């Protein structure tokens, strides 16, 4: 039964081609979110970051899995961090996949980039009803500016309140080569 993935990756030529190798493998029952924006139809005054968030949000609403494709600099790119943090709020399943081991035209690869889930985290409020978000930037953990703290529908138990959790303790990260993504990629999403 068909499922749609949101591919979260950052924009760079050296990892766009590696993302396309993954896309070349992901059938009839497999969909992925894709943008369509054309700024000529609509006003540069209105095309701000909230307009960007509205398009990302809407694309995410039609998916149930967010799959973060990890290259060398993915961990610190603004819009990838937003896609991950907004995916948490919407309750998507989230996984990460290292794709730096796809060879370029000279046969080179790159070492694994840092886990983007290591640079993001959250903390429940003292009353257990609000989720506060954080990102690693500027040498310390900053309150996450791109997505404000939000109320959760289920109160957190007191044992979970006031404790910081990095996302790497919550979401699984695969290695395309070591984990045989060629044969097991569908099992990671489904």
């Amino acid at each position: 039964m068909a499922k749609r993935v949101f591919f979260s990756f950052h924009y760079q030529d050296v990892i766009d081609f590696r993302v396309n190798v993954v896309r070349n493998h992901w059938t009839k029952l497999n969909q992925s979110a894709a943008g369509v924006f054309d700024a000529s139809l609509w006003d540069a005054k209105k095309t701000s970051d909230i307009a960007l968030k509205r398009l990302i949000n809407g694309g995410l609403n039609n998916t149930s899995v967010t799959c973060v494709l990890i290259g060398s600099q993915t961990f610190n790119r603004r819009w990838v961090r937003y896609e991950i943090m907004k995916s948490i709020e919407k309750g998507n399943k989230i996984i990460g996949i290292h794709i730096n081991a796809f060879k370029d035209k000279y046969g080179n690869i790159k070492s694994k980039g840092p886990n983007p889930f290591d640079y993001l985290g959250y903390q429940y409020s003292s009353d257990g009803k609000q989720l506060h978000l954080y990102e690693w930037t500027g040498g310390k953990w900053e309150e996450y500016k791109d997505l404000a703290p939000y109320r959760v529908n289920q109160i957190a138990p007191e044992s979970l309140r006031g404790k910081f959790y990095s996302l790497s303790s919550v979401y699984r990260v695969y290695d395309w080569v070591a984990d045989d993504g060629y044969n097991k990629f569908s099992s990671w999403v489904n």
């Binding site: 396309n20 979110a33 894709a34 694309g59």
Partner: peptide, 30 residues
């Protein structure tokens, strides 16, 4: 996004068609 299966395979393009649903933001590859 262009690939060919085999040295003499017929090349194809992953991005030839984006599908556009009736509801706003329902745009996808598939």
């Amino acid at each position: 996004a262009v690939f060919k299966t085999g040295l003499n395979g017929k090349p194809y393009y992953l991005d030839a068609i984006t599908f556009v649903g009736e509801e706003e933001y329902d745009t996808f590859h598939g």
